Amino acid sequence: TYSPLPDDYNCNVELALTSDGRTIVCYHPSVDIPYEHTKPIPRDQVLKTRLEEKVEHLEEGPMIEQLSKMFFTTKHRWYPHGRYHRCRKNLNPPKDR
Amino acid sequence: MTGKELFEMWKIINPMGLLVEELKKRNVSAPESRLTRQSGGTTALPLYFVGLYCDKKLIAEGPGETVLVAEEEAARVALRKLYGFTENRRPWNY
Amino acid sequence: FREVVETTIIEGRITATPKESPNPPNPSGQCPICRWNLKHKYNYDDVLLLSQFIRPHGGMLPRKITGLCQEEHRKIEECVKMAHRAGLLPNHRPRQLNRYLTRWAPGSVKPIYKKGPRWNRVRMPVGSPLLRDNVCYSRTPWKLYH
Amino acid sequence: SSFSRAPQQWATFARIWYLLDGKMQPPGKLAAMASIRLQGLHKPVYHALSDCGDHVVIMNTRHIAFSGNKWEQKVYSSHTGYPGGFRQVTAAQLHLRDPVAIVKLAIYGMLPKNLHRRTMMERLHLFPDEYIPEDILKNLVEELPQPRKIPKRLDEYTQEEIDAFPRLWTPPEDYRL
Amino acid sequence: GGQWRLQQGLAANPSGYGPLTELPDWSYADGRPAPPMKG
Amino acid sequence: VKCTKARYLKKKNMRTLWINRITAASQEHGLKYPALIGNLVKCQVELNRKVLADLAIYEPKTFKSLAALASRRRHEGFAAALGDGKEPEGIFSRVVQYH
Amino acid sequence: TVKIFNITDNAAIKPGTPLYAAHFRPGQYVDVTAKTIGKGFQGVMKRWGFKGQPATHGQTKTHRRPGAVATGDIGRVWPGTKMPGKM
Amino acid sequence: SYLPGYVPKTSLSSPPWPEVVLPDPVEETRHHAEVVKKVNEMIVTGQYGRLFAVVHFASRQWKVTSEDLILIGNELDLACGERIRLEKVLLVGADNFTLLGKPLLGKDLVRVEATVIEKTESWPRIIMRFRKRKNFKKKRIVTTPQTVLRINSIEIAPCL
Amino acid sequence: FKNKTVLKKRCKDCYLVKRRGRWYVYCKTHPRHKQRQM
Ligand SMILES: [Mg+2]
Ligand SMILES: [Mg+2]
Ligand SMILES: [Mg+2]
Ligand SMILES: [Zn+2]
Ligand SMILES: [Zn+2]
């Protein structure tokens, strides 16, 4: 009836000591998300259904405020940069794993 | 082939199709997709964790920015689990 | 208790009175607080105890009648003032800014326009120096000044 | 977890929309947990250049509570930089003008004073009442628990609690009360 | 945890005179002991 | 000169980042950083801050095991402090002795 | 010019409607808003009514200028300082 | 009848933290035995894969797995291409179980095998001292010798 | 009122009241005895 932590969010941690007492053994199988805890996946007569291509060009001000409102950022991220920094940027960065 | 994954070495097109064919040929029910976890949704950067279930039992779960790509990634995870090429599998004995 | 009515005819009657619970854990105590082992174990939240020790109209009962000692009486008085300001006694009323731990009366403090240097800073008092001696249950003591 | 690399990165660095309630909460305790969640310091993948803050939605900011006499003592100062721009308003006056200003200013003071601060502020969302927009309400995950414990007014006590608490003293039978 | 380690007699720094700091770091894969560390 | 002194600053900042991430993971499991660290040292588990943050990120189940172990050691210490007598030492509060 | 008039809900009039001068009546009080006569860039005497400097008695090229614009302790000029500009 | 010491339920009467009762030691010891036996049967069967280990080496702690690389910052008196046994294993873990030493795991339990694959020098590190108006400027350049090891294998044995 | 640091009752009718955070000496019969604490 004792549990050091709740056993319902990541894994079922069971602690143990060996009989000599020199090593600690942890048994932690994962917890699976239940079916009951999930949620189901959400679901011109005479002419062609013409594809609706409109791209209203917006000025720098309205475009930056639209981007900033959509991504919850400030305008300063969207304003451009100069040629000094543009050529300072590393376009072949090192990549690990 | 040490540090690469299955669908970086072997390109596939319809992981859901491959998964349902495998489940049909090993005689279990067709997997049901359900939205296990969800963040955002009305934003431009959502997170969807879609799980694949069989007889009300979880066989896979996968993340994505949309529900469809989350379902596709969950299908890929299920295929890796069935084929045995999983990320925490036993490394090669040299 | 005792009531008086007017109708001119005025008369008083004796009505039913509550009694102490039968077996106190410390029968050798003097005040009811000392008797029931509550010496440092109550705050302004404990409106059950404070409602035992107040009048029907929010005022306070005196010492010769409550049996309280002086330290306990002053502590109950401050707890009752803080409870009244926190609104924890909705039915003990006389005759919107939400508060708790309010030491002074809200219409008598002037705003701190000039805080001092940080060696001579003007602090805002919170709580009560009479309730300074309560049980801490913490490795950091009560902060009486914010 | 056997994910692909791009979905694994998306899952690791995805943003979460936490929900926080006002209703008798100190603005600074609300602000401490809001600043933690807005910076991303609750994540173990935290780094200050990892841009790993999340969205915090605080409601009922009109019903916050100040301990002590801070409603009448605490002064917010600003200066419209014209000669004579110095304004000093009490927390009461500021609350009666703008019912999100106190919580907003507390969170603003607790966030780090760099060029990321206003970005975290624009991921902070404050609403004075129970009303939250529908898009935010479909965005939310995890209503965080309240830092204060709602000391439970006297008339809210059940009769079981009232008669379980013992009567401390005997009143004299001739007192007017 | 230095005062706890002092109370148990296990130094104060875990890099002081314990098995963790005095046992050899490695040995040859067939089982031959390593030449001793200079520290 | 900045390079030469930034070596020291690099070591200090990396320890600060490790403490931050351990704090985050411990608080996700309901513990605090002093609780976790002190009770792991009392459990004689000598994982440092670097590998503790690494386990916080890449092995969440191993970190939850460590957090449950530290929480149990904290509870054993509390129970021994309240008992104050010669009650048995506790399973995880036994100390392995070396000679 | 289009101008926006704040009205209550009971004073709504259909868009596209003509308005005349008998909307107003004699013996009443009105407020009249307009862009004033522009004077261009003007100095402090015409813009702000500064007293300026005397003509004779030794004065060098200073008859129509602002004197000190601030004090010496502040190393700046306060915002809103009256200076030459567009009137 | 109230016991002597009964304090009525107020806010400060009882401690804020919930009361915790630990398991009875003999039943808990049998539980430890059954958990260790289950994990030992898991090791015997082989229901694991991709072990990792936290290993103490060259004053440092490395979280290594199989097929790994670590860069030790000193020479290691070993020829290139040579297999050695890492021994001071603080932790070994897998999916569904981990093993923890106090402070070290026994060498009968876990074996870490690595291989010296490179012995090299670090890029030059500049040490410059400068104090102003006191003519204090010195420059030194060092290169610290280094050894790159590949972690080959992490093997656990049934010994619990 | 007169400002005092030390408030003293100069009559038998003077009474001490703490109002708006300060002590006051009020006298209903000798109004010159009115004192305000500093
Ligand atoms: Mg003139
Ligand atoms: Mg001249
Ligand atoms: Mg002239
Ligand atoms: Zn007493
Ligand atoms: Zn007088």
PDB file of C-alpha atoms in Angstrom, chain C residues 11-135:
ATOM      1  CA  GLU C  11     -38.134  41.500  30.023  1.00  0.00           C
ATOM      2  CA  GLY C  12     -35.208  39.109  29.876  1.00  0.00           C
ATOM      3  CA  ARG C  13     -35.157  35.328  29.730  1.00  0.00           C
ATOM      4  CA  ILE C  14     -32.536  32.608  30.058  1.00  0.00           C
ATOM      5  CA  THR C  15     -32.198  30.395  26.986  1.00  0.00           C
ATOM      6  CA  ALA C  16     -30.154  27.281  26.294  1.00  0.00           C
ATOM      7  CA  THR C  17     -26.377  27.500  26.773  1.00  0.00           C
ATOM      8  CA  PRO C  18     -23.667  25.303  25.221  1.00  0.00           C
ATOM      9  CA  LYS C  19     -21.402  23.352  27.545  1.00  0.00           C
ATOM     10  CA  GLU C  20     -17.752  22.370  27.350  1.00  0.00           C
ATOM     11  CA  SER C  21     -16.977  19.034  25.714  1.00  0.00           C
ATOM     12  CA  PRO C  22     -16.820  16.490  28.554  1.00  0.00           C
ATOM     13  CA  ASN C  23     -13.195  15.292  28.766  1.00  0.00           C
ATOM     14  CA  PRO C  24     -10.476  17.860  28.030  1.00  0.00           C
ATOM     15  CA  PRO C  25      -7.085  16.277  27.299  1.00  0.00           C
ATOM     16  CA  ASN C  26      -5.317  18.587  29.782  1.00  0.00           C
ATOM     17  CA  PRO C  27      -7.625  19.054  32.789  1.00  0.00           C
ATOM     18  CA  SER C  28      -4.848  20.875  34.673  1.00  0.00           C
ATOM     19  CA  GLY C  29      -4.775  23.765  32.200  1.00  0.00           C
ATOM     20  CA  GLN C  30      -5.962  27.234  33.148  1.00  0.00           C
ATOM     21  CA  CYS C  31      -7.332  28.918  30.015  1.00  0.00           C
ATOM     22  CA  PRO C  32      -9.519  26.921  27.608  1.00  0.00           C
ATOM     23  CA  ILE C  33      -6.648  27.104  25.112  1.00  0.00           C
ATOM     24  CA  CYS C  34      -4.203  25.614  27.619  1.00  0.00           C
ATOM     25  CA  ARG C  35      -6.824  23.023  28.595  1.00  0.00           C
ATOM     26  CA  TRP C  36      -7.476  21.875  25.026  1.00  0.00           C
ATOM     27  CA  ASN C  37      -3.781  21.997  24.013  1.00  0.00           C
ATOM     28  CA  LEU C  38      -4.003  24.761  21.425  1.00  0.00           C
ATOM     29  CA  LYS C  39      -1.297  27.003  22.876  1.00  0.00           C
ATOM     30  CA  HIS C  40       0.467  27.723  19.574  1.00  0.00           C
ATOM     31  CA  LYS C  41      -1.659  25.716  17.140  1.00  0.00           C
ATOM     32  CA  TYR C  42      -4.217  28.112  15.685  1.00  0.00           C
ATOM     33  CA  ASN C  43      -4.191  30.886  13.091  1.00  0.00           C
ATOM     34  CA  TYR C  44      -6.620  33.449  11.679  1.00  0.00           C
ATOM     35  CA  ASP C  45      -8.119  30.623   9.577  1.00  0.00           C
ATOM     36  CA  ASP C  46      -9.545  28.784  12.594  1.00  0.00           C
ATOM     37  CA  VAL C  47     -12.918  30.456  12.503  1.00  0.00           C
ATOM     38  CA  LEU C  48     -14.517  27.597  14.422  1.00  0.00           C
ATOM     39  CA  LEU C  49     -12.482  28.572  17.510  1.00  0.00           C
ATOM     40  CA  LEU C  50     -12.811  32.294  16.820  1.00  0.00           C
ATOM     41  CA  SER C  51     -16.594  31.955  16.404  1.00  0.00           C
ATOM     42  CA  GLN C  52     -16.634  30.203  19.761  1.00  0.00           C
ATOM     43  CA  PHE C  53     -14.920  33.267  21.208  1.00  0.00           C
ATOM     44  CA  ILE C  54     -16.833  36.149  19.525  1.00  0.00           C
ATOM     45  CA  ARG C  55     -20.178  37.935  19.900  1.00  0.00           C
ATOM     46  CA  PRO C  56     -23.107  37.457  17.480  1.00  0.00           C
ATOM     47  CA  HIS C  57     -22.339  40.829  15.859  1.00  0.00           C
ATOM     48  CA  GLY C  58     -18.595  40.468  15.251  1.00  0.00           C
ATOM     49  CA  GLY C  59     -17.383  41.999  18.496  1.00  0.00           C
ATOM     50  CA  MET C  60     -15.380  40.197  21.124  1.00  0.00           C
ATOM     51  CA  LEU C  61     -16.258  38.721  24.573  1.00  0.00           C
ATOM     52  CA  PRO C  62     -14.082  39.747  27.529  1.00  0.00           C
ATOM     53  CA  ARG C  63     -11.512  37.857  29.554  1.00  0.00           C
ATOM     54  CA  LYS C  64     -13.382  37.428  32.851  1.00  0.00           C
ATOM     55  CA  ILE C  65     -16.055  35.499  30.941  1.00  0.00           C
ATOM     56  CA  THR C  66     -14.120  33.563  28.315  1.00  0.00           C
ATOM     57  CA  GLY C  67     -11.678  32.542  31.043  1.00  0.00           C
ATOM     58  CA  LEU C  68      -8.817  33.317  28.666  1.00  0.00           C
ATOM     59  CA  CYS C  69      -5.411  34.444  29.812  1.00  0.00           C
ATOM     60  CA  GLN C  70      -4.070  37.727  28.482  1.00  0.00           C
ATOM     61  CA  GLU C  71      -1.661  36.438  25.816  1.00  0.00           C
ATOM     62  CA  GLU C  72      -4.304  34.093  24.450  1.00  0.00           C
ATOM     63  CA  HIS C  73      -6.950  36.824  24.566  1.00  0.00           C
ATOM     64  CA  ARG C  74      -4.816  39.253  22.563  1.00  0.00           C
ATOM     65  CA  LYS C  75      -3.975  36.494  20.086  1.00  0.00           C
ATOM     66  CA  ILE C  76      -7.660  35.620  19.611  1.00  0.00           C
ATOM     67  CA  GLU C  77      -8.403  39.332  19.166  1.00  0.00           C
ATOM     68  CA  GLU C  78      -5.840  39.711  16.383  1.00  0.00           C
ATOM     69  CA  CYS C  79      -6.971  36.467  14.742  1.00  0.00           C
ATOM     70  CA  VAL C  80     -10.565  37.717  14.810  1.00  0.00           C
ATOM     71  CA  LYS C  81      -9.601  41.065  13.256  1.00  0.00           C
ATOM     72  CA  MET C  82      -7.679  39.273  10.494  1.00  0.00           C
ATOM     73  CA  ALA C  83     -10.604  36.882   9.939  1.00  0.00           C
ATOM     74  CA  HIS C  84     -13.049  39.785   9.675  1.00  0.00           C
ATOM     75  CA  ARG C  85     -10.809  41.495   7.132  1.00  0.00           C
ATOM     76  CA  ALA C  86     -10.413  38.224   5.213  1.00  0.00           C
ATOM     77  CA  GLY C  87     -14.192  37.838   5.211  1.00  0.00           C
ATOM     78  CA  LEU C  88     -14.141  34.450   6.929  1.00  0.00           C
ATOM     79  CA  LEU C  89     -17.075  35.445   9.178  1.00  0.00           C
ATOM     80  CA  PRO C  90     -19.918  36.266   6.760  1.00  0.00           C
ATOM     81  CA  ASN C  91     -22.687  36.072   9.374  1.00  0.00           C
ATOM     82  CA  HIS C  92     -21.028  38.027  12.214  1.00  0.00           C
ATOM     83  CA  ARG C  93     -21.585  41.420  10.598  1.00  0.00           C
ATOM     84  CA  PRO C  94     -22.189  44.863  12.181  1.00  0.00           C
ATOM     85  CA  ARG C  95     -25.548  46.504  12.979  1.00  0.00           C
ATOM     86  CA  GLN C  96     -13.970  44.819  -3.618  1.00  0.00           C
ATOM     87  CA  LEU C  97     -10.347  44.000  -2.832  1.00  0.00           C
ATOM     88  CA  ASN C  98      -9.522  40.571  -1.502  1.00  0.00           C
ATOM     89  CA  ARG C  99      -7.363  40.233   1.562  1.00  0.00           C
ATOM     90  CA  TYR C 100      -5.836  37.922   4.080  1.00  0.00           C
ATOM     91  CA  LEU C 101      -3.290  38.355   6.869  1.00  0.00           C
ATOM     92  CA  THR C 102      -4.345  42.011   7.221  1.00  0.00           C
ATOM     93  CA  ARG C 103      -2.744  43.521  10.323  1.00  0.00           C
ATOM     94  CA  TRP C 104      -3.937  47.141  10.198  1.00  0.00           C
ATOM     95  CA  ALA C 105      -7.322  48.586   9.330  1.00  0.00           C
ATOM     96  CA  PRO C 106      -7.385  49.132   5.542  1.00  0.00           C
ATOM     97  CA  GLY C 107      -8.363  52.796   5.731  1.00  0.00           C
ATOM     98  CA  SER C 108      -5.572  53.900   8.069  1.00  0.00           C
ATOM     99  CA  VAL C 109      -2.370  52.993   6.187  1.00  0.00           C
ATOM    100  CA  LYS C 110      -0.772  55.426   3.860  1.00  0.00           C
ATOM    101  CA  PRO C 111       0.851  54.208   0.645  1.00  0.00           C
ATOM    102  CA  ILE C 112       4.620  53.719   0.682  1.00  0.00           C
ATOM    103  CA  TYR C 113       5.585  56.336  -1.868  1.00  0.00           C
ATOM    104  CA  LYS C 114       9.281  56.418  -0.952  1.00  0.00           C
ATOM    105  CA  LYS C 115      10.731  53.023  -0.189  1.00  0.00           C
ATOM    106  CA  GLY C 116      14.110  53.365   1.412  1.00  0.00           C
ATOM    107  CA  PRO C 117      17.531  52.119   0.428  1.00  0.00           C
ATOM    108  CA  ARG C 118      17.905  48.444   0.892  1.00  0.00           C
ATOM    109  CA  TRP C 119      19.583  48.982   4.308  1.00  0.00           C
ATOM    110  CA  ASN C 120      16.660  51.192   5.410  1.00  0.00           C
ATOM    111  CA  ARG C 121      13.810  49.728   3.369  1.00  0.00           C
ATOM    112  CA  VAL C 122      10.210  50.454   4.362  1.00  0.00           C
ATOM    113  CA  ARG C 123       8.545  47.039   4.623  1.00  0.00           C
ATOM    114  CA  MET C 124       4.855  46.143   4.455  1.00  0.00           C
ATOM    115  CA  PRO C 125       3.648  44.319   7.589  1.00  0.00           C
ATOM    116  CA  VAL C 126       1.941  40.956   7.125  1.00  0.00           C
ATOM    117  CA  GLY C 127       0.426  38.854   9.875  1.00  0.00           C
ATOM    118  CA  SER C 128       0.862  39.390  13.565  1.00  0.00           C
ATOM    119  CA  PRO C 129       3.809  39.605  15.968  1.00  0.00           C
ATOM    120  CA  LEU C 130       1.546  37.984  18.550  1.00  0.00           C
ATOM    121  CA  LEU C 131       1.198  34.957  16.245  1.00  0.00           C
ATOM    122  CA  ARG C 132       4.983  34.984  15.801  1.00  0.00           C
ATOM    123  CA  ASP C 133       5.219  32.116  18.313  1.00  0.00           C
ATOM    124  CA  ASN C 134       3.053  29.634  16.403  1.00  0.00           C
ATOM    125  CA  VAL C 135       4.295  26.217  15.329  1.00  0.00           C
TER     126      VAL C 135
END
